[PDB]
């Protein structure tokens, strides 16, 4: 300040003072420490599978069996992403695929009462938080509320994916019945694989006593 007179000789955050007429500088380094899925996305998006490959090659021929082993079991996944031709940043999703309505049906039965899949309520309680958040990131709200609200997003999203691999599974209020997510349909005895693919009810059949 002072039209080119006083000048700080050290790094740090600058602080304006109207009362004491001073531009004070507080020692600090501008660092980008970002915490969250965003940062992880940054790293994954900047990764060089090729570099890490040729590096882990030299790393693997290390005489010690341990290091060699970890290097193997690493370059494994790396090579997977190589031969496949897929980018790891996709593992961090920006757009959540919504399943079609007839796949997640809601229909009324006799008596008039309705019915619905658990994945519907999941796919709903997701959008709620992802929305409120979008309003906050607009209207200028404090980092605490943001970091927490955004946390419930990363957990809700995952709840629509694998419900229960983290914490007590979300259930309809009042009931202890876990919500069935995408992964809940596939895996399992009665899942869409074992009950609706490798076996099924049929047509033109029947049974009786012998």
């Amino acid at each position: 300040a002072d039209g080119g007179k006083v000048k700080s000789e050290i790094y740090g955050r600058v602080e304006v003072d109207l009362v004491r007429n001073v531009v004070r500088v507080v020692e600090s380094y501008d660092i980008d420490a970002r915490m969250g899925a965003e940062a992880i996305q940054e790293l994954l998006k900047e990764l060089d599978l090729e570099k890490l490959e040729r590096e882990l090659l030299e790393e693997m021929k290390h005489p010690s069996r341990a290091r060699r082993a970890k290097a193997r079991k690493r370059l494994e996944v790396v090579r997977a992403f190589l031969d496949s031709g897929n980018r790891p940043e996709w593992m961090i999703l920006e757009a959540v695929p919504v399943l079609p309505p007839d796949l997640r049906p809601m229909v009324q039965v006799d008596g008039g009462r309705f019915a619905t899949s658990d994945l519907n309520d999941l796919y709903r309680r997701l959008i709620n938080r992802n929305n409120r958040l979008k309003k906050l990131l607009a209207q200028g709200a404090p980092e605490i509320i943001i970091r927490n609200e955004k946390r419930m997003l990363q957990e809700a999203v995952d709840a629509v994916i694998d419900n229960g691999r983290r914490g007590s599974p979300v259930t309809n209020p009042g009931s202890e019945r876990p919500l069935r997510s995408l992964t809940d349909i596939l895996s399992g005895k009665q899942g869409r694989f074992r009950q609706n693919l490798l076996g099924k009810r049929v047509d033109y059949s029947g049974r009786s006593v012998i």
Partner: protein
């Protein structure tokens, strides 16, 4: 029972990938590495050692 057992031992662990693009300890099938070494012998390159 024999069929089952055959399926039980059909995977071998790699030792010294040699001239192949394989990696030490990269476990794969029997017939696979077999055919690999088969071609490698013809191409003049050194085969791959492995443990059942």
């Amino acid at each position: 029972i024999e069929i089952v057992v055959r399926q039980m031992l059909k995977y071998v662990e790699v030792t010294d990938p040699g001239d192949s693009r394989l990696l030490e300890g990269q476990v794969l099938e029997k017939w696979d590495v077999e055919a690999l070494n088969e071609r490698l012998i013809a191409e003049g390159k050194v085969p791959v050692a492995w443990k059942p």
